[PDB]
Ligand SMILES: CCC(=O)Nc1ccc(C)cc1O
Ligand SMILES: [Cl-]
C-alpha cells in the first residue's frame with residue numbers, strides 16, 4: 389500500500405513517506421534550495437528563460453546556459469544533465485515541460501540512482517510555459533515515485549521535495565497527498 393501519513397514539519401511544508409522515501413511539498417523559490425539534483429522545466433531546445441527556467445538559468449549562470457545549447461545541438465534529447473553552476477546542487481536535470489510528466493520524473497529518479505544521489509528538488513513540472521493542468525501534474529509526479537518504490541528501485545534516493553511557485557498549486561499537491569495517505 390506504500391503510503392504513510394501526511395504531517396507538517398515546518399509552517400507551510402508537508403511531508404509523507406512513500407515506501408522508504410520522504411516526499412515533501414512547500415511553496416517558495418526553488419533557486420534557494422540545496423539538493424544533489426535540482427530539476428528545470430524547459431522547452432524542447434533547452435534555452436527557455438521564462439518562469440522557473442528564467443530563475444534557474446539566471447542563478448546557475450552563463451556556463452550552464454552554454455552547456456544546455458551545446459548538448460541540444462549534438463543530438464535529439466528527451467532531457468539533459470548539466471553541472472549546477474552557482475546553484476546549491478551537484479547537477480541540474482533539464483526536462484521538457486510539455487512531455488509526459490510521469491515519464492520525466494521516472495527518468496530523473498533513475499539518473500539519481502545511477503549517481504548514488506540521495507536528494508532531489510523539483511518544481512511543478514509542466515504547469516508554467518507548457519500549461520498542463522496542476523491536478524494531472526500532481527497525480528503524475530506522485531505516481532512516478534510510487535512505481536519506482538514498487539519496482540524495488542529506491543536504494544540511494546531518500547528525499548524528493550517539490551518547491552512550488554503558486555500557493556494555489558501547492559494546495560492541489562496537498563489534497564493529492566491526503567487522498568493517498570495510509
Ligand atoms: C514549472 C512551473 C513554473 O514555471 N513555475 C515558476 C517557478 C518560478 C518562477 C519565478 C515562476 C514560475 O512560473
Ligand atoms: Cl512548464
Ligand SMILES: [Cl-]
Pocket residue numbers: 440511512513551552553554
Ligand atoms: Cl512551480
